[PDB]
Each structure stands twice: as C-alpha cells, then as structure tokens.
Structure 1
Amino acid sequence: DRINTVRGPITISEAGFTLTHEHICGSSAGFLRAWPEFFGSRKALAEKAVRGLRRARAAGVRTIVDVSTFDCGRDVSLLAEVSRAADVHIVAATGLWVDPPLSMRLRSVEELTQFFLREIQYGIEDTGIRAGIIKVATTGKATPFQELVLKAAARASLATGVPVTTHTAASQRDGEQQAAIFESEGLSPSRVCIGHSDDTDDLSYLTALAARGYLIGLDQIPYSAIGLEDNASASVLMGNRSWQTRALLIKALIDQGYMKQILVSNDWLFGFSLYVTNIMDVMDRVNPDGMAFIPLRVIPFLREKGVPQETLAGITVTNPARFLSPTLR
C-alpha cells in the first residue's frame, strides 16, 4: 500500500493526478555526467526540468513516472533534485530499454533478475533510492536478449509486486508477444502496461490486450510531425497522425468498456540525446506545453466530446494508483 518515489515512499492518495510515462532526460548511461554540455549544462537542464514540472503541477499534475532505465540514461540524482525543487513526485524505473551496453547484453536471465531486484529492493546505484516500476522494450519481434529482459522483469515483478511497463512498436503489434512471454512467466496482466499503444489505430489489437486485463498506455499523445514533414528525426519519432487522432483512442476505449485499463501520458522529456542533436528544440516547437499537454489540451478535448469528469478523474488518478501500488494481483 506504498509507492516508492525518488524522495521516499508515498501513500496512494499522495500520488494524485499521475502521468505514467515521462522522462526528465532521454539519454544513455553516464552520458549526462560525462557530457553535460550536450544539454547546455547540467544546471540548464535542471532549471528547464524544474520549470516544466512546476507548469505541469500548476495544471494539476502531482506525480510523474520517469521511465528512463539504466541504458536509457536515467540519472536518479537529477530526478531526486528536480523532484524536491518542484514538489512533484517522481517514480524512478528499473529494467532495460532498447540500447543495453555489452555489460548487460552478456548477462543471463538470472543475473538480469538480480539487477532489477537490486534497483527495486536495495536502491539505484549508491543512492538508496528504490525503483517503483520496471520498464522493458521491444521494437518488433523480441531479440534473444529481449526475451531474457522480459522474463527477468516478470520475475522481479512477481517477487516485489512492482509493475512492468513497456516500450513497443504498436505497428508491429508488439504487445501480443510481450503478453505471451509475461503470461508464460505467470505474471498477472493487471501488473502490466503495454505502452506506445496509441501509435496505431488498430483497435482490435488494443481491446484484445484490454480484454486479457492489461493496461493500455496511450502515452505519446502530443507526438506529431505534421508541418515538420521533411524533418527525418521528427517523423520516425512522432509519426504522421495528429494528437487528436491519438487522443480519440482514449474515447474509443472508454466506449468499448475499458476505461479502467487506460493510462495516459505525454512521453515528454527535458533532455534528449538519442536522435538529431537538437531534437528537443524541435519537440518543444511541436508541444510548447510539455508535460502540461495532457491536462491542458487532452483533458478538455475529451470533455468537449462528452467524456464525464468522473471518467477522466478515474483515468488520471484511480488507474495509476491501482497500477503503481505494489501487489501481485
């Protein structure tokens, strides 16, 4: 009945309005520490991030879940710093993303399980800060290594009650194989969110997962490259569908009986080193609201379309709490 944050455990009520897939900095292990000038400076990155969280907070956001893993450039100390400065809860992640180093790629499923358990039960690095979620990733059919990561995440979840959240290629219908591997590990679908699921309009894929009891992460709502057509990065990054097209999936799933399975987010960041050098400026030009995009634009959008207050509050408050609070079922 307690969710771990970068400032300690909080109760369920304290979580409140939660964004379930966000980042402070999108990068690689040690990159921020080794080359902060890439982000202007570590101080500039911090100030940017604090200003963003304060705006999100003014918009009603109380908690975010930072789903940056070790190899995804998680700097937990930075997460801790910005959290106290903005008074926004940040839940830190363990697991692995799509770019694990050789030191991880050579590990067994038993060692991977030990490491995830470390970051959950013991602490991240030497900070004593505990991960509150496990993040895994595939882009298309799982590699032999990604099979181990997924099995290991399932095992860490089953041992702690901490949930698993995923990065997918929705077009490749990644969730159907992620689901198959998790259920073979005996992991409850109620402990899993299949993310990036808003990247496609394939509703039959989404309700199949939602029917099994998975959580559906519609977590890139503001992502759109419309207007920035010839920008290579922004197109592979954000695709061609409008934000209103991504947000309609929320109503569509509400209308098929699955509002209790919907988690919503921006997948926003304040630093991003994994594309063209200036990808953060380009994303900022697309979404000047940042993390406040969900509460300022998406929530009113759905209200205008007839979705009651009661249902919206359930998606952004009740759903993340049920999901994040440690349990096996």
Structure 2
Amino acid sequence: GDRINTVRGPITISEAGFTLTHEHICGSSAGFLRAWPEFFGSRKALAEKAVRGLRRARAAGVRTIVDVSTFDLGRDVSLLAEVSRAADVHIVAATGLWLDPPLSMRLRSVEELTQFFLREIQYGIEDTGIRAGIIKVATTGKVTPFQELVLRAAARASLATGVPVTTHTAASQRGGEQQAAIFESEGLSPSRVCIGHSDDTDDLSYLTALAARGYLIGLDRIPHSAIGLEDNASASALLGIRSWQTRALLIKALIDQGYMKQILVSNDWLFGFSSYVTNIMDVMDSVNPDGMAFIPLRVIPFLREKGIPQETLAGITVTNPARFLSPTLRA
C-alpha cells in the first residue's frame, strides 16, 4: 500500500525514483542459466556485464528497474539480487508466465496457476525469500486457451495482493483488447494493468481507447527499431523497420490527448539472451549501444526538444511507475 518489494527487500514508494518498468537482466529459460552458464561465457561474465549496464543506467538517472522475466524466461532472482546490490539499482522481480511454459506449467488449471503466482508474491521465489512485485503475462493472436488461463490467474493473484499486471501482446493485432476483456471479466481494475509492446504499432486510436479505459500503456520497445538490418533473417521479427523517433512520438501523442498519467516507458533491454538465435546479443548491442540508458539518454531529450515539459517527463518516469507498482486494491 506504501511499500514495493524488490530483490533486496521492501522499499518505500519515494525510494523508487526514475523507474524503467519493463526490462530484463537475462532472457533465458527455466533452469538454463544454472545448467549452461558457459552459454553466456560464464555466470560471472553475465553478472559483470549487467552490473556495468545498470551502473550506466544509474548514471543516466535510473534508480529502479522492473525485471519482467518470469519463471519460463529463466528468471534467476539470485542473479538479480547480486547485480542489484553491486550496481545500487533497485530491481523489482516478476511472477507470471511468458510464451514458453514447460509441460508442468501448461497442464495446470487456473486455480493451480493462481497458487503458483501467489506463492511467488506472498511467500517468495524459490527458497530465496525474495517476493515478486509484478505479474507478467504474454499472449499471441486472439489469446489461446492456456493464455486465457494465465491471464485469469494473474488477475486473481493481483486481486488478492494488490500487485499490478503487465502484458506482452501483438500490438499489430490490437491484442490488448482481448486481454482487457478477460481482465475486466475477472473484476480487475484497468489501473492495475499495463498493456505493453504497445509501441509495436502506429494505431493511436487503439492506444487512446485503452488509456481512456484507465489502462496503463507500455511504450516499452522504443530502441527495438534497428534500421539497416534487412540482410538479417531474424532482426526484423525481433527488431524494427521504423525509427525509434517514430515510436517515441507516440509518447507525445498520448500526452497531448490528456493521458500522460497512463504512460509507462522502458527499453525492453537485456544483458544476455539465450531464448533466441546464437549471437543475438552482439546484434542488439551494436544496434543500441546505450542499452538500458537509451530511454534517459535519447528518448527523454528527444521529447524535451519536442516541447514536453520537465514536470511531465518526471510524471511519466517517476510518478506513473510509483502509482503502478504500489500495491493497491482501490481503483
């Protein structure tokens, strides 16, 4: 209600500061970092890359990130705790399920998944005592039967705990509409929900409609714009053809409609990435050498020079995340 759980323990809302609400230390798979750390060089190398990355973002003004890696994205909260401490950057951990659940998850009922998400929020992740502060869910297309189960379990776990829900969808399919329908059917307030990867599209009427319903809008893939990589047979499905400035102007466009309170902005960056083709990290790092500093270093100045006042930018990057992450059951 006033405290947010991080991988170093609870913090007050005022301690969160400039918060990146959709990031990853490492995009992987359950068990993978511990079974095959040499895939990333070593555990130590990955840790060190992350601490440098977070220290870079911290010098650009960032104070907290939300690592939205779930169980099936190979979240290792011990790694998150280690990196957080060494970089002095708060990290909020996530529960939920992304798009690669193993059989032991895919065969579970909504009631069972609800208990799993609740365990991670109320008791702790694994045997670490670290509690999740957000629920991450993902869907494709019009929402598969299992994904619907995940979304309902997420809503139930949110309703019991006050922690918010953040989603990945296919914005080019206006996938947020179907997510919103399911959440509302469960009695979840839209102000507990961020509809994300929303900058994957240029359909502003869609985004405005969601914000008008009280949904947070996650404009979280701004540096995923590539430009120059059409020779690559995997850098158009994970990156982009439009510029990052195009994506960033969506931020301005929602502000102007009166919805600055509904906007969350992030990089959707990571320091290791095993759930994709080999060497993808060298590709991504060359396209965005700023990493998690891209928002404070490129996007914030770009908006400032398009006329957005300081107080609005602080509203989006400090106030909005604090309101979102503070556990609440009140609408």
Measure how far apart 1:205 and its partner are.
Answer: 0.6
1:47 matched to which residue of 2? Answer: 48
Instruction: State the SS of the aligned residue for 1:234.
Output: coil
Deviates more, 1:269-278 or 1:259-268: 269-278
Tell me, yes or no, if the aligned pair for 1:20 and 1:65 is still in contact at 8 Å.
yes
* Alpha-carbon displacement from aligned partner over 1:233-280 (angstroms, at most 9, x marks no partner): 211001211100110000000011100000000000000012111111
Residue ranges of structure 2 left out of the alignment (5+ in a row): none
Query: Counterpart of 1:68?
Result: 69
Q: Which residue of 2 aligns with 1:119?
A: 120
Q: Secondary structure, in 3 states, of the residue corresponding to 2:73?
A: coil
Structure 1 residues 121-156: Cα deviation after superposition (integer angstroms, max 9, x where no partner): 000000000000000000211111001000000000
Is the 8 Å Cα contact of residues 233 and 275 (structure 1) preserved in structure 2? no
- Structure 2 distance, partners of 1:96, 1:307, is 36
Provide the residue aligned with 2:10 in structure 1: 9
Give, in whole Å, the separation in 2 of the partners of 1:74 and 1:246.
Answer: 28
What is the CA-CA distance between 1:75 and the residue it aligns to? 0.5
- Does the Cα contact within 8 Å between 1:225 and 1:240 map onto a contact in 2? yes
1:229 offset after TM fit, Å? 1.2
For the aligned residue pairs, the C-alpha RMSD in angstroms reads: 0.5
Alpha-carbon distance in 2 for matches of 1:114, 1:56: 35
- Kindly indicate whether the alpha-carbon contact (under 8 Å) linking 1:193 and 1:216 is maintained by their aligned counterparts in 2: yes
State the 1:225 CA deviation.
Answer: 2.5
- Give, in angstroms, the shift of residue 185 of structure 1: 0.1
- Structure 1's consecutive aligned runs of 4 or more residues displaced over 4 angstroms after TM superposition are none
Worse overlay, 208-217 or 219-228 = 219-228
Deviations 1:190-238 (A, max 9, x none): 0000000000000011011000000000000101131111212211001
Once the two structures are superposed, the pairs formed by residues 224-243 of structure 1 within 5 Å of their partners are 224-243=225-244
Cα offsets for 1:274-316 (capped at 9, x unmatched): 2111111100001000000000000000001000001000000
Other structure's SS at 2:10 match: strand
Structure 1: any 5+ residue segments left out of the alignment? none
Q: Which range moves more in the overlay, 224-233 or 193-202?
A: 224-233
For 1:52 and 1:165, locate their aligned partners in 2 and report how far apart those are by CA, in whole Å: 23
Q: Tell me the alpha carbon deviations over residues 146-174 of structure 1, each in whole angstroms, 9 at most, x when there is no partner.
A: 01000000000000000000011100111
User: Matched residues in 1 for 2:103 and 2:180: separation?
Assistant: 26
SS in 2 for 1:238: coil
CA distance in 2, matches of 1:61, 1:234: 28
Q: Distance in 2 between matches of 1:141 and 1:266?
A: 25
Contact 1:197–1:217 (8 Å) recurs in 2 = yes
Q: What SS does structure 2 have at the residue aligned with 1:45?
A: helix
SS in 2 for 1:85: helix
Which residue of structure 2 aligns with residue 295 of structure 1?
296
- Measure how far apart 1:328 and its partner are: 1.5
2: CA distance, partners of 1:51 / 1:254: 33
Contact 1:3 1:11 in 2 (8 A): yes
Partner Cα separation in structure 2 for residue 139 and residue 307 of structure 1: 34
Retained in 2: the 8 A contact 1:69–1:135? Answer: yes
Once the two structures are aligned, what percentage of the paired residues are identical? Answer: 96
Q: Deviations over 1:63-87 (max 9, x none)?
A: 0000000001100000000000000
Q: Is residue 133–residue 164 contact of structure 1 (8 Å, CA) maintained in 2?
A: yes
Residue 276 of structure 1 aligns to a residue in which SS? Answer: coil
C-alpha distance in 2, partners of 1:231/1:78? 32
Name the CA distance, whole Å, in 2 between partners of 1:200 and 1:245.
Answer: 10
1:27-52 deviation digits (Å, cap 9, x = unpaired): 10011111111111100000000000
Q: Distance in 2 between matches of 1:171 and 1:230?
A: 23
- 1:164-187, CA deviations, whole angstroms, 9 ceiling, x for partnerless residues? 000111001110000000000000
TM-score (norm 1): 0.99
Deviation per CA, 1:85-137: give whole Å up to 9, x if none. Answer: 00000000000000000000000000000000000000000000000000000
**In the comparison of the two structures, how many residue pairs are matched?**
329
Structure-2 separation of matches of 1:242 and 1:233: 18
Give, in angstroms, the shift of residue 24 of structure 1: 0.1
